[PDB]
Amino acid sequence: TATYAQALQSVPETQVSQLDNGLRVASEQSSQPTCTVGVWIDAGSRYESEKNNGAGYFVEHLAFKGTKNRPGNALEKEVESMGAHLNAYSTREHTAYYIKALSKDLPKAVELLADIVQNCSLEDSQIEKERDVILQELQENDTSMRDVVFNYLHATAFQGTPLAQSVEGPSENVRKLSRADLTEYLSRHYKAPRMVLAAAGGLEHRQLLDLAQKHFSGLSGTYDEDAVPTLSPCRFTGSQICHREDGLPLAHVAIAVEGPGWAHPDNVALQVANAIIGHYDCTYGGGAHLSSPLASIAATNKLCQSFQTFNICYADTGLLGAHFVCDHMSIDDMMFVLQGQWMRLCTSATESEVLRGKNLLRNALVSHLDGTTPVCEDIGRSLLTYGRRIPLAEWESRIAEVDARVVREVCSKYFYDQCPAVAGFGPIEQLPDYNRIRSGMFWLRF
Amino acid sequence: RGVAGALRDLKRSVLCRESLRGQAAGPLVASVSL
Amino acid sequence: RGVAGALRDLKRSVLCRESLRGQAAGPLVASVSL
Amino acid sequence: VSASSRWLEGIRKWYYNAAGFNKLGLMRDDTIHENDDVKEAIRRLPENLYNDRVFRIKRALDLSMRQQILPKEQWTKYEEDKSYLEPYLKEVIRERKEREEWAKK
Amino acid sequence: AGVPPHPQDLEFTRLPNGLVIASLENYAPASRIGLFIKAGSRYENSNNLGTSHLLRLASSLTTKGASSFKITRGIEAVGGKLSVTSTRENMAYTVECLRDDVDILMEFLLNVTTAPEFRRWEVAALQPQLRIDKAVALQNPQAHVIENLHAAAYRNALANSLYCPDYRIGKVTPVELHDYVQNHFTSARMALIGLGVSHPVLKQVAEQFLNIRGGLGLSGAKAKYHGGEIREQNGDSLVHAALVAESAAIGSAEANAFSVLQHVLGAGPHVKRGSNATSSLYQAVAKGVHQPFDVSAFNASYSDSGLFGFYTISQAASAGDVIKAAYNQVKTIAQGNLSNPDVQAAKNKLKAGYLMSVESSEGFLDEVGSQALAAGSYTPPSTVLQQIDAVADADVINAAKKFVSGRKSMAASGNLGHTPFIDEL
Amino acid sequence: EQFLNIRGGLGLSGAKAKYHGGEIREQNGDSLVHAALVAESAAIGSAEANAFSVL
């Protein structure tokens, strides 16, 4: 009986509080018996310099390996024994540590996150152990062409800036990174005004804020020293990187233009345009009858094994484009059909397909915020980027504002006659020359 | 997208002992979609 | 010509009981020549 | 049902025998012009009807070479002309009309 | 204040024809409807193997009420989703969309499940997708090992693979698809589950369209455990191996004992890049093996049988040392060496993992659908935790004893030069 | 004596065949079932081998 619009109002408001040391504490209560809690830190490779690049990824390997009060196995045995799950990740702008556990285990869970973020042991015997482990992971990542081609895209698109740096760091920095480099990274970036304690599930916001005062109070905050980090802008460069390797059976291509960044209202309309182009895989059932002309033609003529659009967001910048993988004789056809859809939407987008892109986005947004861990991530990441939780009803308002005119104007603002950043890897002899790619960013008929 | 679940293009390599944990099975499930 | 011995292009069909006798094996041998 | 509908059928049988493709052993659907809809319908025919269509066209092309025809006993009788392709072609057209109606929205 | 509403209860109804409707109104922006069917690969026989795979791939072919074009464009227009999930016992047609579009996707779901035409040319064009689907699946070495593990354990009906045998690709006929739907997609073999939907409309839909009278009754073709071993010498870098014995059918109290035994031994990690201290199988192998490896307890419970054991990944030369170390670790539990704190930590991992697996609508719908076919009822989570608490330490030990003394089934793939046979364990 | 005097790089191996038993089943689309049922009998040259040849 309840309508879709009415269901957006029923979602509980995300309660936000802030301690006296700058640590923000946010929660979304539900009736669940489980929950997710974690700390989102405004740190990443974009803050690291060339000498200490990969330091954050190194700390991730040491965060769960021992603390001053829980050395070695003690942390794992506590997490495992209560059936909880402990995880972490690191992007170029955000680092996160979160726990999944029962609701009754909320106080123990927060207590462990505090001991992890603040009292990391970093034993020299352990640092040498993780030195070889990260090096093996670097060899593993080399075999994932998708991870390679997207690192190349960042490397060439943001060349000369911190964003070109990968999260893992270069193999030479992992070998010469000392314990002092890591502690310097922690005291510099793991500061209370730059962290957000997020929770989601069955829990009242009071007990979270109490636990925040109980365990995170002992953390220097609101004035460290005259050592404040600040993210400068990062130059985007139209450029091309081509790793020719004819031993690999399929080529990987990633092409993109410069996006606006996290806070720009244009991201909503861009995601609608990307949803129209959508994504494809050889295991999809639709094939020729798919709505997306690129997916239909890619399946009918077998131009690729897969493609995906993306809108990667960073502070005041981003990578907007698509990535695909295909046989060595389909790289040209695939690039042609892809660019033709950017130009078609820049110039002659229609109302019905734009409604499909809005409906795909509404379904994507609600399907993603299903579970305590997705919502806990949305809380933590949003407070760092947006400084607030944007309610679902607001996203619906911005989506409903988009129409065909918005897509034509917004797509032309970022796509039409713009220099892309191209990254290629594999059998890419047939990858078009950059000038030919650059000419595909405008139409002579328009 | 097609999915194969068991834990309860050259893909990649898994060499170290840390990346191997979670690979051992724990009943297959085959999902297909549009 | 290559040979496979065991009895001690769509090839053909063997339907009746008279043509089946001798088909059952009786140790493989693989021969190759020019 | 009435004497007048037998006269419309009477001239249709006249035009049928005047069209003369029955003299070569062909059927009406053998003579249709192959557009994209017709090519798909032929593609969907079962094996037996496809092989029968192929031999009748082959036999008629052989006769057309010699400027000959079949004996009258072997001509295609108007009453026995099987519209083997029309149900397939009607469905191909119906699908295209649906694709063309979605393209308008 | 910021508190959520009062959560509704799940409505549940059995119709006299055997059909089961269960709905929950969670007031979410999205709706989710699943039709769960006892039509998994177990109901194939040696003449129509792979028919349920091709059926799983044919959800967007033409129906009597909607062409293939309309189903694809109609669902994508509202941003919806249509999925088909298969196990060895069930097929689950799931549909997702915003709650204002439930009616449209319901109509498609019923057409796909109750009025497929299986056109001769559409089916023929779909046959090569079996090769692509199977190839994508089988690049996980786990998939083929567990295919062979079931082929080795059972004489019938669970030896059947989830994926179509190669010799059958292109041979599955439209008649076999029609016969499969008429025989298995019937009222007494079905359950209509819904989220973000009212109970009356599902019950209304169930009575209007899902009243298909049984073409084949609830089959008594019981799975017959036999045991054996299948070994696949290949060029993989690591040896995958699973050693298993018949354990227990799902829903029985003995099944809960094996589930606790699974978490006493260890099944999947809890900490990113953790040493897995509380996993007795991992620590037992790490004693005598210092190379990279992985080990996990395997638990597969079905309607009329079950398979419990463990799964190993190791270097080719360490394959026997890893397997014997793991198997000996199960023996010490069967000899009685099992504390009470060890069992309680296992119950916490089990109870916690069950609750976590039903946080999402995707995991909740799958659980309710599986309970409806397996049990004909809905058991709430607090009752599930109650059943887990009722497992005694002796029940966990007797489950280990049943594994040690039971006729084994084994599947292995890799360079098997140092991988023991069953009789060598 | 001129050419075939190659001295042993590997001696006459004692890698004895170990009978174990079991079964391999191949579900395919052949028209007829082929099946062989067998047990360990005897090494060649022994008197027991001649008995199996008569059998």
Ligand SMILES: CCCCCC(=O)OC[C@H](COP(=O)([O-])OCCN)OC(=O)CCCCC
């Ligand atoms: C009467 C006017 C005819 C105009 C045709 C035209 O200029 O051709 C296209 C190119 C430049 O466009 P592009 O190759 O970047 O393609 C853009 C794709 N979006 O121009 C040239 O360099 C080609 C040289 C022509 C010599 C006769």
